[PDB]
Amino acid sequence: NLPEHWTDMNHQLFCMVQLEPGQSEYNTIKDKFTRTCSSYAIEKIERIQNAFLWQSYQVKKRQMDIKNDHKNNERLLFHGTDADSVPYVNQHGFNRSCAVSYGKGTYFAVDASYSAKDTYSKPDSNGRKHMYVVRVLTGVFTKGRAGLVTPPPKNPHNPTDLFDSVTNNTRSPKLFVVFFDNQAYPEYLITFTA
Amino acid sequence: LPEHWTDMNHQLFCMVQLEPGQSEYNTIKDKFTRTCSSYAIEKIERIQNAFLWQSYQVKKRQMDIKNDHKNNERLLFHGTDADSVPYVNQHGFNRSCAGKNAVSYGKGTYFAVDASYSAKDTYSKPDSNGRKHMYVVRVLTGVFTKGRAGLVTPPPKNPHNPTDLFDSVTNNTRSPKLFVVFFDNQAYPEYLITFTA
Numbered sequence: 001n002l003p004e005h006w007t008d009m010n011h012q013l014f015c016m017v018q019l020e021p022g023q024s025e026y027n028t029i030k031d032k033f034t035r036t037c038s039s040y041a042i043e044k045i046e047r048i049q050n051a052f053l054w055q056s057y058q059v060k061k062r063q064m065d066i067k068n069d070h071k072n073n074e075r076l077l078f079h080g081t082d083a084d085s086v087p088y089v090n091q092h093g094f095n096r097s098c099a100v101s102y103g104k105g106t107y108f109a110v111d112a113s114y115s116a117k118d119t120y121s122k123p124d125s126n127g128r129k130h131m132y133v134v135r136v137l138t139g140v141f142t143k144g145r146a147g148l149v150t151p152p153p154k155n156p157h158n159p160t161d162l163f164d165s166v167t168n169n170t171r172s173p174k175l176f177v178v179f180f181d182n183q184a185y186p187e188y189l190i191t192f193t194a
Numbered sequence: 195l196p197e198h199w200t201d202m203n204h205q206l207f208c209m210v211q212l213e214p215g216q217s218e219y220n221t222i223k224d225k226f227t228r229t230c231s232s233y234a235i236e237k238i239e240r241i242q243n244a245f246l247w248q249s250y251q252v253k254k255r256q257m258d259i260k261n262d263h264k265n266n267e268r269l270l271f272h273g274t275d276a277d278s279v280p281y282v283n284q285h286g287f288n289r290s291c292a293g294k295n296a297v298s299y300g301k302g303t304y305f306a307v308d309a310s311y312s313a314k315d316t317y318s319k320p321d322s323n324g325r326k327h328m329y330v331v332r333v334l335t336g337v338f339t340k341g342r343a344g345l346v347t348p349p350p351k352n353p354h355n356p357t358d359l360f361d362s363v364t365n366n367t368r369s370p371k372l373f374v375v376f377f378d379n380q381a382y383p384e385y386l387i388t389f390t391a
């Protein structure tokens with residue numbers, strides 16, 4: 001069930017598609033980034049077409065939509081990473097096993113400006129920085145804390161019925177942490193400079 | 195969902211107690227007694243977890259596509275403590291919760307070929323009533339190599355293509371006795387064996 005806005009992959013299961021600047025898709029993703037990163041220069045935006053990651057992610061989304069008994073489980077967030085991690089994330093997505101104040105999960109920022117920090121989007125031996133735009137199944141969330149390996153339970157009387165993610169601040173979240181594979185789909189890769 | 199599962203009436207999860215004398219019970223008992231003849235089985239439960247099954251079967255279809263005509267799936271054992279059983283039944287095998295193995299071939303979830311390995315008190319810790327717990331697990335071993343203690347994912351097949359990974363690792367490729375998996379939904383807890391001395 002590969003999305004309509006994907007372009008043909010000649011029967012292959014993975015490709016990185018460079019977006020055409022000035023077209024609707026590129027402009028939408030650039031706007032999300034320039035909301036907080038207008039001083040950064042975008043070299044390119046690539047659409048990540050990873051059939052297997054998409055499949056696994058969409059299954060988790062359908063499950064979370066059933067479990068939570070409503071949609072609105074998905075947020076579009078940012079993830080800065082070093083150039084050496086980009087091939088892995090493109091192919092395999094996010095891996096909690098690869099500061100973790102809110103738990104031992106994968107971190108995503110609400111604002112590109114946070115992911116744009118050199119500590120996350122480390123400039124490569126050419127000044128280029130890399131940030132993903134990520135579909136994240138945040139679902140029902142709670143405040144995180146150091147040392148979590150999964151989200152807390154919604155009620156400790158049922159210790160296996162878990163929150164879907166944690167955040168720094170439930171009323172005004174700026175980051176989300178997920179603890180399971182295939183809760184996040186890297187949808188675009190932005191290559192940019194300071 | 196498999197057509198021989200009990201009707202769960204829209205419910206997403208059930209444990210089904212098997213009957214001795216049914217082929218399904220007897221095959222698991224025989225697989226267990228092959229190496230654990232000194233222990234006695236209290237009961238065997240079939241684990242019907244719709245979401246874990248769906249996610250696992252997606253991963254299996256993907257590995258079946260990627261590997262072409264490999265037997266990607268092995269039926270293996272996993273001993274665990276009573277405290278972990280409710281979590282595994284609902285959520286499967288989380289590498290983030292895994293103990294360090296006495297012989298480490300990587301930081302992942304360990305599965306044994308022989309029930310005797312999983313039957314060690316270090317894995318199937320007897321509970322306060324002397325009950326030991328072992329899962330029988332469909333594991334996507336895929337294409338595997340000898341692991342190494344440092345691993346947090348399986349190693350690449352080719353050092354010049356670091357993202358094209360083995361599916362799992364083992365202690366010995368010639369004579370595998372354990373497999374380690376490093377990803378969620380690569381192992382489906384199919385049966386829970388409750389047993390005693």
Ligand SMILES: NC(=O)c1ccc(OCC2CCCC2)cc1
Pocket residue numbers: 078079080081099100101102107108109114115116120121175
């Ligand atoms: N890679 C990223 O984009 C990213 C990394 C870390 C992120 O929050 C880290 C928390 C904020 C302060 C304490 C820990 C968010 C995003």
